[PDB]
Design an enzyme around this catalytic site. Structure first.
Site, PDB file in Angstrom:
ATOM      1  N   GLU A 297       9.420 -12.914  16.636  1.00 23.51           N
ATOM      2  CA  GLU A 297       8.727 -11.951  17.781  1.00 23.51           C
ATOM      3  C   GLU A 297       9.971 -11.089  18.387  1.00 23.51           C
ATOM      4  O   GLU A 297       9.574 -10.143  19.054  1.00 23.51           O
ATOM      5  CB  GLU A 297       8.671 -13.051  18.948  1.00 23.51           C
ATOM      6  CG  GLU A 297       9.932 -13.810  19.526  1.00 23.51           C
ATOM      7  CD  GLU A 297       9.615 -15.230  18.735  1.00 23.51           C
ATOM      8  OE1 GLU A 297       9.415 -15.566  17.972  1.00 23.51           O
ATOM      9  OE2 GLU A 297      10.009 -16.357  19.649  1.00 23.51           O
ATOM     10  N   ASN A 298      11.129 -11.026  17.959  1.00 25.97           N
ATOM     11  CA  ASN A 298      12.081 -10.101  18.268  1.00 25.97           C
ATOM     12  C   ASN A 298      11.985  -8.818  17.544  1.00 25.97           C
ATOM     13  O   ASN A 298      12.618  -7.874  17.486  1.00 25.97           O
ATOM     14  CB  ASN A 298      13.670 -10.680  18.433  1.00 25.97           C
ATOM     15  CG  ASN A 298      14.112 -11.115  17.086  1.00 25.97           C
ATOM     16  OD1 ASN A 298      13.340 -11.963  16.519  1.00 25.97           O
ATOM     17  ND2 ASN A 298      15.211 -10.810  16.701  1.00 25.97           N
TER      18      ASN A 298
END
Lengths: 472, 467
Positions: A297-298
């Site tokens: 998700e980063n």
């Protein structure tokens, strides 16, 4: 774009009480020189919009130690004692915001969208309100989050979220050309890119200033139009929070059995997002011939194994903040684009741990009132899409045979009716849309009766109930 | 990502009535092979979501000729005779949608956002309703658009727009590596990029397939996760709509208009007078020109050998860019324009009201081609809007009046009016102020050529002219 040599000169006009967006995910992509500049100006009572709170002596934490922050808007704030002390002491206001919602709101702020609808947070404290923003000295709650408006669309429920705009944005980038165009290196991009577009004044610090032409016009991450003030970073420590290296994992009986079953969820060509721990460990037993695409998700698609001493890069870390690597064919992208992908249901599988799971798929894994309040990270977004299959890996019961699977969760919810399958060392449960929790697998030597006394709710049993499988 | 060798095999399962997103801005970035395959499948009654309708013999125009489209959702449908006949005869349905709104709705559809607010279209037929979607054979309107929901946020009104999702998306890209990662070339990106994320099944046609490693991981425009089906284009014409190359009344407007430019300014100019003024910008001055189809850093028209079908401006003219320029999707472009990052919007108009209302996209019963990106360009309060236009229309009919009689593009959005006779500063609450006057003219000459009253700046000066 106006260029500066002194970072203090670039932020000397940030007003006390200003809302400042601070790029960064963990210690990756943090504007340390601009943060050092704020330490020098002594500007205070700021509302810092940052995914995390850095650590005790780096990133935001430094502004926490100097008491320059009055209010934080973040998704995850663990691993920072100073933050914890201030927050729990009533000295720091904090708005725990789902990482994806936070990203899209910043994004909307720069795109002239005052508000938009999202399903993330629906059925949780985000929507219902009540999330602790400020604590009193005694421990009671002084300020709680207010409920969100819920609206239906296509038979599903969404909540209204407002854009986030800042007076200033402190951004860390890799390179800026003499025109002001900007680019980000690896996963250091995360929130920095969307933050460059949502503030009245964006101030960017780069490691290098490059000539015009250094970038293909098609590969400019942030066009100059967004860079108001630019400064070349005077110094860079790029601290690594969690050094994870591999020398070129089963553990105990319970963990080993869950890992080996969880490894069988992976399918050839599948896009998956795996929480640290069991899920990530399960990816270790994925067939060498099976292709699984791991998403972080980063802002990463195509995650690889932990780096060897020579591959260690502070700009490359997974959601668990661990130094990692990416495989050939991998791609990087901003936090907002990352959650668009997750919220839009483009990820096939989301596998993570949980403290509690309900009969109909409710998940609870981000907070324990009066004990653990560190934020939800991107966990709410990860389980928000109906097109994505959600698998939970967890011990069947807690100490003292305390139920973890029940009719309804007693802990704050991460998501409502989102879990599709549950895998414990004792059994595997499918949560079908009509019957709910259904036992489909049972560990050899155990009986349905063994499962009934370990489970908090009653459940249907599949007529095709098989011994629990274990990755060969 | 599943790779196909035949375009038809990749779209053969598109259902009759399906909503299909077709990338492309003008004739730049259109999936011609996927479109040709749709001709062979014979699928029909499609709802085609595309910015424009190509031309009579290229792009969506082909699907219109084969009568495979029942409804079009577009921002600008001019330069297409086929579209014109069907639309006017009541055979084709058309949802005229502002370009920036169309782009954000598509992006919302791929990001799990079902609805969002935008001030674009407020005060116009878009918000109010009444935009002609379908006509009767007797000339009247069979289907008009319904009013959008209005909501206030921090002193300004926005309208609710719902996400656009497609069953299929027909996208044109440049290169894809063997992993399924795609990249776009120059201004050919436009809607192709966002559309690749908003359909259940995306079909991408590329010109080349490269090895894994040919792209920098940070410079992949569309990651493999979005590319469901991929085919290497079997043929590419890449037609060019308008080949633009290089080697008094109007002159007056152009020369005053050039003085609106400032050093380091970001502006978007409409074709005609506004763009012509950029030719008079000083060389010691840096003005950054933006194009809504995804360009920042526009240069002059290309020399014969610089002509590129993938590089056109909003007016569909072939152009070039200057070093330091950048390309970006249509949603990114309008986020830029909608967020008020562009400092100046200068464009033509048919009518401007006393308080800044602008009318420049539709003439009832005589001209209906779409508003394009004009409604988005005047939607930000942070952007200075300057109108450049002749003072009066044929028969000396006023163009500056109390209230516009032509459908509005924007409400209270014009900051300054530049005609061949005078310059007016516009205030949404007090009205027009005569700040400059053409020499030889008197305030009375303006009073009888103006549909409303106006104040006269005490600093009234003769109208300036770029030297």
């Amino acid at each position: 774009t106006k260029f500066y040599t002194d970072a203090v000169e670039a932020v000397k006009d940030i007003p006390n009480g200003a809302t400042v967006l601070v790029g960064g995910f963990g210690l990756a992509g943090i504007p340390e020189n601009l943060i050092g500049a704020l330490l020098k100006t002594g500007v205070k009572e700021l509302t810092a919009v940052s995914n995390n709170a850095g650590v005790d002596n780096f990133g935001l934490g430094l502004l926490l130690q100097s008491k320059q922050i009055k209010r934080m808007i973040s998704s995850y704030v663990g691993e920072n004692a100073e933050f914890e002390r201030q927050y729990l002491a009533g000295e720091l206001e904090v708005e725990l915001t789902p990482q994806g919602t936070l990203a899209e709101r910043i994004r909307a702020g720069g795109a002239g969208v005052p508000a938009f609808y999202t399903s993330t947070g629906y059925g949780t404290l985000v929507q219902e309100g009540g999330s602790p923003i400020k604590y009193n000295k005694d421990g009671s709650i002084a300020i709680a989050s207010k409920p969100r408006e819920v609206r239906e669309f296509n038979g599903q429920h969404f909540i209204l979220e407002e854009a986030i705009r800042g007076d200033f944005a402190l951004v860390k980038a890799w390179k800026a050309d003499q025109a002001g165009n900007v680019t980000f290196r690896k996963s250091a991009r995360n929130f920095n890119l969307p933050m460059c577009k949502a503030a009245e004044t964006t101030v960017v610090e780069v490691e290098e200033i490059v000539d015009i032409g250094s970038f293909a016009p098609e590969d400019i991450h942030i066009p100059k139009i967004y860079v108001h003030r630019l400064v070349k970073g005077e110094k860079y420590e790029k601290r690594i929070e969690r050094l994870s290296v591999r020398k070129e994992k089963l553990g105990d009986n319970v963990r080993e059995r869950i890992i080996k079953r969880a490894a069988l969820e992976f399918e050839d060509g599948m896009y998956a997002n795996l929480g640290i721990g069991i899920p990530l460990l399960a990816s270790n037993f994925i067939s060498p011939n099976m292709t699984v695409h791991l998403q972080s998700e980063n802002g990463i698609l195509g995650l690889g194994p932990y780096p060897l001493q020579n591959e260690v890069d502070a700009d490359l870390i997974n959601a668990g903040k661990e130094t990692v690597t990416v495989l050939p064919g991998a791609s990087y992208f901003s936090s907002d684009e990352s959650f668009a992908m997750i919220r839009g249901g483009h990820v096939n599988l989301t596998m993570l741990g949980a403290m509690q799971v309900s009969k109909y798929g409710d998940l609870a894994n981000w907070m324990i009132p009066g004990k653990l309040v560190k934020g939800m990270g991107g966990a709410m977004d990860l389980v928000s899409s109906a097109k994505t299959k959600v698998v939970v890996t967890m011990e069947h019961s807690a100490k003292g045979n305390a139920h973890k699977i029940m009719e309804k969760c007693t802990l704050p919810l991460t998501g409502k009716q989102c879990v599709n399958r549950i895998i414990t060392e004792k059994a595997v449960f499918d949560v079908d849309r009509k019957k709910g929790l259904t036992l489909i697998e049972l560990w050899e030597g155990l009986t349905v009766d063994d499962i009934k006394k370990s489970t908090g709710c009653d459940f249907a049993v599949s007529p095709k109930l098989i011994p629990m499988q274990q990755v060969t």
